[PDB]
Design a protein around this ligand. Structure first.
Ligand SMILES: [Ca+2]
Ligand SMILES: [Ca+2]
Ligand SMILES: [Ca+2]
Ligand SMILES: [Ca+2]
Ligand SMILES: [Ca+2]
Ligand SMILES: [Ca+2]
Ligand SMILES: [Ca+2]
Ligand SMILES: [Ca+2]
Length: 335
């Protein structure tokens, strides 16, 4: 009376389950329901299903209906199966222990469950100032363990760039935008850069980027006290300090030197007096200006002193002396 054994409707069943599906979630089975048929009559025609194989442990099968569901006490993770493909053996038994087989081929679908991740999370990089537009500063990289659009990453700067830095959305190369990079304008930058996936609930991971502007000595010394007039007793002896010129250089390691470059002497009748180059000296380091020759209103009533400062450490000649020069008028007073 048991002249037949069970026999599945298809020889391979193709099925898919979304990862992180909760327990009891049924398989989505693309080619009909799992079904086995035994052509005996009566009691010898009833079947009981088993599910067998390497990752059978992740599932349970109703032995009456052959429906397959996510076992409880387990979590299915697509990042733990490479390829994302599972192969299982369906077995069908009648009451005499006669068999039928078919094949369950299961694809784990992808859930956007992994964050774009920066390793390292932080970047510190030196960039020399006066760099041309488009100079590559660095490249940041993130990794997302998901795949398809869930793993594909667009880079962006959320803030800190100040319109002086741009980032290529794909490569993650950070480069210089339109504006120039002057260390004296700003000596560092902190960027919050963001890598974001394209899952339908997009996930993001961020990275701190610190950018450190190295110095070229490219900044000219500037007198803080560029015009003065001082009246000086005709009885002021040589060595007497009468004025002090001071300049400031915003580069990292200036060596400032102060020079008198002209002295122009005038009569109380306003005509030039020649060869008065030696009337005043200037301390080369402090900018302290002293009387140097003996004085007299009757010989020279006024001196126009012109004073300049040079950074010796300057890396560009064109930004190494003062503009303007310091001007000190000196006016002699009778006794
Ligand atoms: Ca049978
Ligand atoms: Ca997962
Ligand atoms: Ca995933
Ligand atoms: Ca992702
Ligand atoms: Ca500069
Ligand atoms: Ca500089
Ligand atoms: Ca300088
Ligand atoms: Ca006198």
């Amino acid at each position: 009376e048991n002249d037949n054994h069970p026999l599945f409707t298809e020889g391979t069943y193709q099925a898919e389950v979304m990862e992180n599906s909760p327990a009891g979630t049924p398989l989505t089975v693309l080619n009909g329901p799992i079904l086995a048929l035994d052509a005996d009559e009566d009691v010898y025609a009833v079947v009981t299903y088993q599910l067998l194989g390497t990752h059978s442990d992740l599932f349970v099968i109703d032995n009456s209906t052959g429906v397959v569901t996510v076992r409880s006490g387990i979590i299915i993770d697509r990042e733990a199966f490479s390829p994302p493909f599972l192969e299982l053996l369906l077995l069908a038994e009648d009451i005499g222990q006669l068999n039928g087989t078919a094949h369950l081929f299961i694809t784990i679908l992808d859930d956007n469950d992994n964050w774009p991740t920066f390793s390292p999370p932080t970047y510190t990089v030196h960039l020399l100032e006066n760099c041309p537009p488009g100079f590559s500063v660095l490249q940041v990289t993130a990794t997302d363990e998901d795949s398809g659009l869930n793993g594909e990453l667009v880079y962006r700067i959320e803030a800190g760039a100040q319109d002086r830095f741009l980032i290529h959305p794909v490569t993650g190369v950070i480069r210089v935008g339109n504006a120039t990079i002057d260390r004296e304008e700003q000596e560092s930058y902190r960027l919050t850069v963001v890598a974001t996936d394209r899952g339908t609930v997009p996930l993001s991971g961020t990275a701190i980027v610190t950018i450190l502007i190295d110095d070229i000595n490219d900044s000219r010394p500037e007198f803080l006290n560029p015009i003065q007039t001082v009246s000086v007793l005709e009885s002021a002896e040589p060595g007497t300090i009468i004025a002090n010129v001071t300049a400031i250089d915003l580069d990292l390691n200036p060596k400032l030197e102060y020079h008198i470059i002209s002295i122009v002497a005038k009569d109380d009748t306003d005509r030039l007096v020649p060869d008065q180059e030696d009337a005043f000296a200037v301390n080369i380091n402090t900018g302290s200006v002293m009387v140097k020759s003996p004085l007299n209103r009757e010989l020279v009533a006024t001196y126009e002193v012109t004073l300049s400062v040079i950074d010796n450490a300057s890396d560009l000649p064109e930004h190494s002396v003062s503009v303007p020069n310091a001007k000190l008028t000196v006016n002699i007073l009778d006794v």
